[model samples]
Target: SGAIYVGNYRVVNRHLATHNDWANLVWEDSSRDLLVSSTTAQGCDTIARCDCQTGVYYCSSRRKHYPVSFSKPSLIFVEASEYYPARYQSHLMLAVGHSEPGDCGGILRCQHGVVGIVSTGGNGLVGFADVRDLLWLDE
Candidate 1:
């Protein structure tokens, strides 16, 4: 079967954002260990609070979630940058160092709880789209 799975968690549904580069994956069953907070970027007090040394749980080519950590927080180029040159919604997108292509949908957690979803990576950086709007839509 071509069913999608994240570790032992089976994906039941996916909610994608209209303007952002993130998605919220609803699992088939509730899990205590895999729980993410209801908090969003708007609720976070600081970026330092959302920072983590621990890596994200990403699916590899073998179809298993592996922990991968990168370096400092940064930003990536997006289509929106063209029109709005100075405004980079720091809360909307976050970038890190060194991630594989398969890590795009990886879960990024920090001290404040789940923060963003891995969107893209290259040139020694990995970009994540904030889970802010997605969590709101889930409600």
Candidate 2:
């Protein structure tokens, strides 16, 4: 299972713009810690986390985007993860996180022995191969 710090992107962007010097004052050497980091507040403040090197403070924009709507369900859950039921595949990308409660997109999964392993995190759908980051069909 995986987890992501929760946050509202709207609040994050506003805060960062106001506190543009937050990194120098707060995060300090936060640049390297942020994986696929960004300064622009496209949606809301993202709830991002880094290894112990960054600590548990305001990392990066200190922002997060709520999937759509949810009441706190575990982000990363590794289990049998049987989807389609009829058939299952391995070593392929799978959808995750609910676009709006009930379902989510952007996460990848692969059969690992008798369970599933999360391959990527934080929006794994993009590019021509990942054209629409929503529901996807394996290629």
Candidate 3:
């Protein structure tokens, strides 16, 4: 498909204590850089980043002491440029890190195909959006 600039987000566990879906994933930039949302705590949901060197996928944020089992998540996107709306909410804070998919273990699902933000009760959450519309873009 044609490529426009949208960040690739992979599904990781949502830290919220419920079964109902909510947006959750780590955002990966065009540069393959991982930007974890600061809104959640020091949680990785035990998912591992795709290794760049050894192609090793492992648990723990590499910052946590108690290691976790392996984690592999799916994908989503965030707008790449200023063309996307400025969030009316001031509570959002973004954190940067390295979670690039290595030559091996990581799998990226969606790319350059997100339409817009999905919200509920005036609160916006995306990872849980119905992705079928985005799939149409692939065809």
Candidate 4:
């Protein structure tokens, strides 16, 4: 992991997606900061961020109206039509939000992990993307 950088990002009306895959990102720097891309609208519906060095992201569900459920090791490095792309057209990476054994109401899933501890997006429809297909920006 690279040295931790002191920075922050805010999720405004829309959600900026993220992933753990590099080949997925067309450009280099674009994938570094708060970036989101998808084939469709529903794909960019959610917002998330994570440390470029570490794949872990911090989320705040306290303000969310609905409960999020997810699990760990959900991201795949390579592209296999049968594996991830096979399941969905685009690829959006998802991580286990609240990883606690037996805790069904916690695993919040999203494209990327938030930089700071701030979650809760939605309600606006100006822009959004599919939930599937999440790859990390180039290293």
User: Which of the numbered candidates is closest to the native, going by highest TM-score?
Assistant: 1
lDDT of 3: 0.23
**How does each model score on lDDT?**
0.39, 0.20, 0.23, 0.25
Judged by TM-score relative to the true structure, which candidate is superior, 1 or 2? 1
Better of 1 and 4 by lDDT: 1
RMSD of 2: 17.3
lDDT of 3 at 85: 39
lDDT of 3 by residue, 1-139 (tens): 0112223323322221122222332332222222222232232222222221112122122422111222122332343333233223211111122232121112222222222111111122111112223332222
Q: Give the winner by lDDT.
A: 1
State each candidate's clash count: 0, 16, 0, 26
Which candidate model has the greater TM-score, 2 or 3?
3
Put down candidate 2 lDDT per residue, 57-84, tens digits, no spaces: 1112223322211111122332232322
Model 3 regions lying over 4 Å from their true place: 1-28, 44-52, 58-139
Q: Write the per-residue lDDT of candidate 4 for residues 91-124, one digit (tens) a residue.
A: 2223333422112112233345322221222232
What is candidate 1's lDDT per residue for 61-129, written digit by digit as tens? Answer: 345544545444444344332223432333334344555655555656665555555655567655555
Weakest lDDT window of 10 consecutive positions for candidate 4: 1-10
| RMSD after CA superposition, every candidate | 11.1, 17.3, 17.3, 13.8
| Candidate 2 Cα deviation (angstroms), residue 56 | 17
User: Which run of 10 residues does model 1 get worst, by summed lDDT?
Assistant: 28-37
